[PDB]
Every structure is written in C-alpha cells, then in structure tokens.
Curated annotation (Swiss-Prot):
Ribosomal protein recorded as keyword: yes
GO cellular component: cytosolic ribosome; cytosolic small ribosomal subunit
Source organism: Drosophila melanogaster
A GO term, aspect molecular function: structural constituent of ribosome
Biased composition annotated in UniProt, kind: Basic residues: 118-127
Residue span relative to the full protein: 25 to 151 of 151
Region of interest (Disordered), ranges: 107-127
BP-aspect Gene Ontology terms: cytoplasmic translation; ribosomal small subunit assembly; translation
Similarity comment: family membership: Belongs to the universal ribosomal protein uS11 family.
Protein known as: Small ribosomal subunit protein uS11A
Keywords associated with the record: Ribonucleoprotein, Ribosomal protein
Length: 127
RNA sequence: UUCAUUGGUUUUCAGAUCAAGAGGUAAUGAUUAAUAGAAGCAGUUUGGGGGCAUUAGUAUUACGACGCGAGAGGUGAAAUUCU
C-alpha cells in the first residue's frame, strides 16, 4: 500500500539536487537536478529551478509507484556553509504539493569535530 | 731588693702570665613567631598547567564496488578545471 523511498535534497549555493532513491540509498529513482533545467549557468540555484527539478521527480517516482518519501536536506556543509541555500524550501513545497504524502524531515548536512583548514587563507575572499 | 761587695743553697715576695678547685650562691645561660619568607602536612583539593603512553570523534581527500542519469565545480558574470 504505502511505500517509502527517500529524497536526499541537496540544496547549496549555486545548485540544488533532488535525488530520490531506495530505502537503502543505492538504486536511484529520478536522479535529476535543477541545474539541468535552466540554461544560464548562474540560474541553477533559483527557487524556480528547485521547483523545476521537483516538478519532474515527484511525478516520475509516481510512475515507479512511489507513494511516500522521507526528506534529507544537505547544506553543503563540509568545513563550508552548513546551511541549506535558497532552493531548499522551494523543493519541499514543490514536492509535497504534488500528492506525495510524506513524513520524515531530516537534515543530513555534515558537521565535523573541527576538521581541516577551509580555503581562502586567513584573510581570505577580500571583496 | 736586703744578705757592706757577690753568687752556690730557698723562701717571703710571688708586680706577673698562663693550668686551677668539685672557693659550682649562679633565675645559670637560646627575644617575638611579622596578615615577611621558605618548609611540612588524614590534608581537602582544584585546573584546555607540563611530558609520555592509550584511544576516540565526525569530516576531508583518495580508492573500491553498487545504482542512476549528464552535466558537475566556480563567479557579480565567465573561463581555466573535471565528466
């Protein structure tokens, strides 16, 4: 009846991913992103494109019979940003308002115990 | 010094100094413990203090495999760069 894949929405600066896959994570369903939806090479990050990604996946997993999903945000925080970018809320609105009745809203962004030396160098990114 | 003068014999004197008594009545003799300091201590401890051993944590790169698709990275915008 109900069936549960996951979503793995990876919403950063400059890009957004919607990567629906198995309960394991391996066998993917509708890998597509928002960066393959707007033809400008700067427009990849827009909330239009995160919908325009999620306007495609949320039907395609229905063509694979997926009724329900879990959500896993990502930021892209390594040493880096550690907050989801502009099109994170643009996907979950686009995904949930396409008849995918979901509950689990988690955030697997990485969070290290003071790891190595992000770039820029001690004064960096002077603007 | 007196033995007129002068010494062998030795005492007073012992000008003396050094032993010397148990002639040792002796208040017999050692200041306080700095809100100085060092030191000690069932002490009770406390601290990312120091050294060496022991290990842990996610993350990062890399590499493997499995799946999925072609775009991914980056910028104010690109491109070099990866596929």
């Amino acid at each position: 009846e109900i069936v549960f894949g996951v979503a793995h929405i990876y919403a950063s600066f400059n890009d957004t991913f919607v990567h629906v896959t198995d309960l394991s994570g391996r066998e993917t369903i509708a890998r597509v992103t928002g960066g393959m939806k707007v033809k400008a090479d700067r427009d990849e990050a827009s909330p239009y494109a995160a919908m325009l990604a999620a306007q495609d996946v949320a039907e395609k997993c229905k063509t694979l019979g997926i009724t329900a999903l879990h959500i896993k945000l990502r930021a892209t925080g390594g040493n880096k940003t550690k907050t989801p970018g502009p099109g994170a809320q643009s996907a979950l609105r686009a995904l949930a308002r396409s008849s995918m009745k979901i509950g689990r809203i988690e955030d697997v962004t990485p969070i290290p115990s003071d790891s190595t030396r992000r770039k820029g160098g001690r004064r960096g990114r002077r603007l």
